[PDB]
Amino acid sequence: KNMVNPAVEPSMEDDLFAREVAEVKQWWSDPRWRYTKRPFTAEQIVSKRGNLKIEYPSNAQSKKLWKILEGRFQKRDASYTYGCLEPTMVTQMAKYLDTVYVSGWQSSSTASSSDEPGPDLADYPYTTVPNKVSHLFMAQLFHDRKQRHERLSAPKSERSKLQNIDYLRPIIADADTGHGGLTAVMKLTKLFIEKGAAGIHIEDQAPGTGKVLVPISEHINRLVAIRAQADIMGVDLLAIARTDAEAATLITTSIDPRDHAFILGCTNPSLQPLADLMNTAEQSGKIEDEWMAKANLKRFDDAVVDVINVAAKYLQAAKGKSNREARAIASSLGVPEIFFDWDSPRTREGYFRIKGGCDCAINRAIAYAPYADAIWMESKLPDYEQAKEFAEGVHAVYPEQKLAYNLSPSFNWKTAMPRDEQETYIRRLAGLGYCWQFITLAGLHTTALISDRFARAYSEVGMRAYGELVQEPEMELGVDVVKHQKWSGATYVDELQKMVT
């Protein structure tokens, strides 16, 4: 029994736990957390920790990101970036952009852990996006080492002629829906932190599925689970809440009364259930359209008003209320019993119909804000006014809440906006409190564009194409990579080699 020992002596267990809860409570008092709500205590967090404290460089980048985005919000400016594929691209973005985005969409088509690509359905294995974050972070880390060495090796007077690129640009990545239940969310979060992420975003859709939402309660839990995992690991990982309620058409359950005001119901008492009808149509293929119309689906508020045609007094009192207390309000104002069934128009998967929109999205963001360092509302157009509506809507309740914007390529920016305004779109939005903006898929498109250009030219005229469209433009622009050996770290590793010999 020479090698048997306890792992923490029982005479110190209680006394170390105290010492640690005092450190966590004192950590939680830092202004980093002044907008953050934790429905758990330091005691429950520390009692899940083990005896070996791990420190992550993720944390340092979270902090770096937090400093950046606050000066961004306080000055009503914006950091903006785009969706990076791979280390060559990240080394060039670092010269001009202070954040890095890692897209799940680009990852679905370029970076799945199983190599099986496809559309953006978050059906890649969930190591995918974190593994891409590491791919970039380890390349950032490396080029930092390479450059530092080149600088410090030369005389101070001479360093003015050398490049001084900030490669350590903090990374924000897509956690999708969280890839499962709340045990998966914490595990996913754990990978993002182990792999270098400075912040992640998570969205209120259902996984495995118009878009289908989860109840607000389910998404809050997610946001808490992320925070619960960063606490425990001791890190300042930004968490970002995305709502897909603007164009969502379905919801999994009707159990959260915050969601009631938007759930659509059939107002036709003669109609049987849709699912009953669709199944018991046993003989047929490729009728749902008419059950829909003949059911005259409405929000309950609209259904109440339409019966009335008191209305105004109804809307004022009913705002935010469950279905039961909205019926009750109405019939207390002399309104007949309205027929409102929201089971009947359920899909054959069991899902509920919803009418989303900008109002449903403000509701969800405000619900999510105590648990989210930043928010965004996916939208169908790059319309500045809708953006101001949403932002004033959220800032009515929480005027310090940071916001984030997706400058999407799913938009046709020629037929959506004049050139003079494309130029001003980030600056204006920043004025509303969108301190972080990003183009999800630029990496994909830039790459597809020059590969199409060059492979064509190269096919037609050969090595003329490499000189004219690649190697000579590189020179004139001063792109470091044209001197590829020096860029790859050949001089850095040569000095390592000699230091050892």
120 Cβ neighbours under 8 A, 6+ residues apart = 104, 105, 108, 109
**Which residue in the set 26, 36, 74, 164 belongs to the binding site for a second copy (CB under 8 A)?**
164
**Which residue in the set 63, 92, 292, 370 belongs to the binding site for a second copy (CB under 8 A)?**
92
User: Which residues ranging from 387 to 406 are in contact with a second copy (CB under 8 A)?
Assistant: none
Question: Residue 183 in contact with residue 220, Cβ under 8 Å?
Answer: no
Q: Which of 132, 321 has the CB closer to Mg ion?
A: 132
Distance of alpha carbon 447 from alpha carbon 409, whole angstroms: 14
395 Cβ neighbours under 8 A, 6+ residues apart = 401, 433
Q: Is 105 annotated as a binding residue?
A: yes
Task: State whether the Cα torsion 79-32-174-405 is positive or negative.
Answer: negative
Q: Which pair of tokens denotes residue 242?
A: 């995305």
At closest approach, how far in Å is the CB of 365 from a second copy? 21
Q: CA-CA distances (angstroms) from residue 56 to 60, 62, 192, 201, 209?
A: 8, 10, 11, 19, 34
Q: Which of 176, 231 has the CB closer to Mg ion?
A: 176
For the beta carbon of residue 55, count every other beta carbon within 10 angstroms: 10
**Which residue in the set 23, 70, 144, 341 belongs to the binding site for a second copy (CB under 8 A)?**
144
**Which residue in the set 65, 93, 102, 197 belongs to the binding site for a second copy (CB under 8 A)?**
93
Strand partners, 127: none
**Which residue in the set 67, 158, 180, 320 belongs to the binding site for a second copy (CB under 8 A)?**
180
At closest approach, how far in Å is the CB of 86 from a second copy? 6
* Phi, psi values for residue 38, rounded to 5°: -120, 105
Query: Coil, strand or helix: which one is 448?
Result: helix
Question: Residue 313 in contact with residue 333, Cβ under 8 Å?
Answer: yes
Q: Counting Cβ atoms within 10 Å, is residue 33 exposed (0-12), middle (13-18) or buried (19+)?
A: middle
Q: Is 104 annotated as a binding residue?
A: yes
User: Which residues ranging from 69 to 88 are in contact with a second copy (CB under 8 A)?
Assistant: 77, 79-80, 82, 85-88
251 Cβ neighbours under 8 A, 6+ residues apart = 212, 213, 214, 215, 259, 263, 351, 352, 354
Expressed in angstroms, the distance from the first to the final Cα of the chain is: 45
Q: Which of 311, 482 has the CB closer to a second copy?
A: 482
Q: Is 440 annotated as a binding residue?
A: yes
Q: Is 334 annotated as a binding residue?
A: no
Indicate the residue type of 308: I
Q: Is 242 annotated as a binding residue?
A: yes
At closest approach, how far in Å is the CB of 394 from a second copy? 23
Is 37 one of the binding residues for a second copy (CB under 8 A)?
no
User: Which residues ranging from 424 to 483 are in contact with a second copy (CB under 8 A)?
Assistant: 424-427, 439, 441-456, 458-464, 466-468, 470-474, 477, 479, 481-482
Contact partner, 292, from a second copy, Mg ion, none, Cβ < 5-8 Å per class? none
**Sheet of 100-102: strands edge to edge?**
79-82, 434-439, 403-406, 374-377, 238-243, 199-203, 171-174, 100-102
Q: Is 103 annotated as a binding residue?
A: yes
Span interacting with a second copy, options 330-338, 348-356, 369-377, 388-396, rule CB under 8 A: 348-356
Q: Quick one: which of 366, 438, 443 has its CA closest to 397?
A: 366
Q: Is 447 annotated as a binding residue?
A: no
At closest approach, how far in Å is the CB of 309 from a second copy? 28
Is 488 one of the binding residues for a second copy (CB under 8 A)?
yes
Is 268 one of the binding residues for a second copy (CB under 8 A)?
no
At closest approach, how far in Å is the CB of 258 from a second copy? 10
Residues that bind Mg ion (CB under 5 A): 104, 174, 176
Q: Is 343 annotated as a binding residue?
A: no
Distance of alpha carbon 297 from alpha carbon 262, whole angstroms: 11
Contact partner, 422, from a second copy, Mg ion, none, Cβ < 5-8 Å per class? a second copy
User: Which residues ranging from 275 to 314 are in contact with a second copy (CB under 8 A)?
Assistant: 275-276, 279
Contact partner, 174, from Mg ion, a second copy, none, Cβ < 5-8 Å per class? Mg ion
Indicate the residue type of 77: D
Q: Is 406 annotated as a binding residue?
A: yes
Q: Which of 335, 482 has the CB closer to a second copy?
A: 482
User: Which residues ranging from 97 to 136 are in contact with a second copy (CB under 8 A)?
Assistant: 97-98, 105, 108-110, 113-127, 134-135
Instruction: Give the residue nearest to Mg ion (CB).
Output: 104
Q: Quick one: which of 479, 219, 245 has its CA closest to 367?
A: 219
384 Cβ neighbours under 8 A, 6+ residues apart = 425, 428, 429
Q: How many residues bind a second copy (CB under 8 A)?
A: 189
Binding residues for Mg(2+): 174
Binding residues for substrate: 103-105, 242, 406-410, 440
